[PDB]
Each structure stands twice: as C-alpha cells, then as structure tokens.
C-alpha cells in the first residue's frame, strides 16, 4: 500500500498473509480474506505459480513475533474456472483456499463480512485497502499491516477513457486513483473494506494496478467485485 498508515492491530481481523515456501523460509506474496474458519478468499493470480502456500492469520508485523499469529497450510485451491492468467483484464481474478485446519477466532482473527450479491457502491464510497504490499512503486513490502483510504470510482467513470477504459469491467470495483494512495505489489488478493450501513464489508479482492506504477492519477486500484461472485463462492464452499 502506497501512502498508507499503519493499521491498528485489531482493525482488520479478516486480513491474512498468503505466503510461499522459499528455501528455509516463507515469503509473503499476497493478501486474502478469511471467509470461513477454513476458507480464504484471494486473487486467482496469486496462486498461478506451482508453489507451496501457507496462510497466516492474526498477523500484524511480518518481521516480528506478534504473539497472535496462527499458521496453516493450504489444502486445496479453487480458482474461478473462467480465470485466464494471460488476461487479468477479463476479470475472474478470484480463488478460494481451503485451509488444512480450521483457525481459531478471536479479536485478531475474524471472518470477513461479504456484501449481498449484486451490491454496487455509489461513486466515492468510503473504503480502505489493507495489506503488506510495496509502500512505493518498485519499493519494498511493508513490515506492518498498512491501510489507505481509497474511495470508490464507479464503473462509468472508471471505464471512461481518462481512467481505465475498457480494461475495467463491471465485475470489478475501482478505488482511489488520487496519485498518492494505492495498492501495490504484495497487496493482491487482499480486501477492500467498505463502510456500508455502519458495518465494514469486503467489497473487493485486490487485483491490479497500472503497469506505469502503483499510485498513478486516474489509474485507481482495481479489485475483483466480491458481490459479483457470491453464488460462486457459496457453491465452492458447499461442494468442498
């Protein structure tokens, strides 16, 4: 997250870190949202590689013991069947991970609230992206979880010529684009939390930014629109 602030430890308890095994260690690669005690929602592109993945819940600082983390392997990966790695702009950038064990809920570990199917947010709706992604374009991952306030940019504006044009689809949510704040590599798969009727819900799964840079004016961060996939999500969890 570029132009973020450090999140308080208990603000976003559904945020997870998706990590891959690298030598004798683990490396953060993406975020995700815990949606059941044994299921995580993340981006399909995060799990394109044939890697060993683990999920960490109750994480705050990737480089220090927080005394709250739970570590669990990924037992099964279900990518949306229409996802195509060669075409992020087509959409369908979503995947569900079934965890090898069910994690224990507490003030640091909670399920993310998903919007009802079909919900669209009004333009300029208040949302926060969270994650450990790069803090600058071509920078480095954050140590501590960051949040940035990124109001939505509705489909009409986002798909206009000055913004993303036809690269953005109505199955996506755009947010930010101010040139200062944005998601960045390593935030992919994580949540966009939006305040609606007094309660934050996870409306987006971070998907992409401009090839030009993370914080680019009129290139808001783009997220898979969660509310476009509610049936798909329920279907997978029920059959797995």
């Amino acid at each position: 997250v570029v132009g973020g602030t450090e999140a308080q430890r208990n603000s976003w308890p559904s945020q997870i870190s998706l990590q891959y095994r690298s030598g004798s260690s683990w490396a953060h690669t993406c975020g995700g949202t815990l949606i059941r005690q044994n299921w995580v929602m993340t981006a399909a592109h995060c799990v394109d590689r044939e890697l060993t993945f683990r999920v960490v819940v109750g994480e705050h600082n990737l480089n220090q013991n927080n005394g709250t983390e739970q570590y669990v392997g990924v037992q099964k990966i279900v990518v949306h069947p229409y996802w195509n790695t060669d075409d992020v702009a087509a959409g369908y950038d979503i995947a569900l991970l079934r965890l090898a064990q069910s994690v224990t809920l507490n003030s640091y570990v909670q399920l993310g609230v998903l919007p009802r199917a079909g919900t669209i947010l009004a333009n300029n709706s208040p949302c926060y992206i969270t994650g450990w992604g790069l803090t600058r374009t071509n920078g480095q991952l954050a140590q501590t979880l960051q949040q940035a306030y990124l109001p939505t940019v509705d489909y009409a504006i986002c798909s206009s010529s000055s913004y993303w044009g036809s690269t953005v689809k109505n199955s996506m949510v755009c947010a930010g684009g101010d040139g200062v704040r944005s998601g960045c590599q390593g935030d992919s798969g994580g949540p966009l939390h939006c305040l609606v009727n007094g309660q934050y819900a996870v409306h987006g799964v971070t998907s992409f930014v401009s090839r030009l840079g993370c914080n680019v004016t009129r290139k808001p961060t783009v997220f898979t629109r969660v509310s476009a996939y509610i049936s798909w999500i329920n279907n997978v969890i029920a059959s797995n």
Binding site: A89, G133, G186, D187, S188, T206, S207, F208, V209, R211
Partner: peptide, 4 residues
C-alpha cells in the same frame, strides 16, 4: 494492467 499490472497484477499486484
């Protein structure tokens, strides 16, 4: 488009 850049996957992040």
């Amino acid at each position: 488009v850049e996957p992040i």
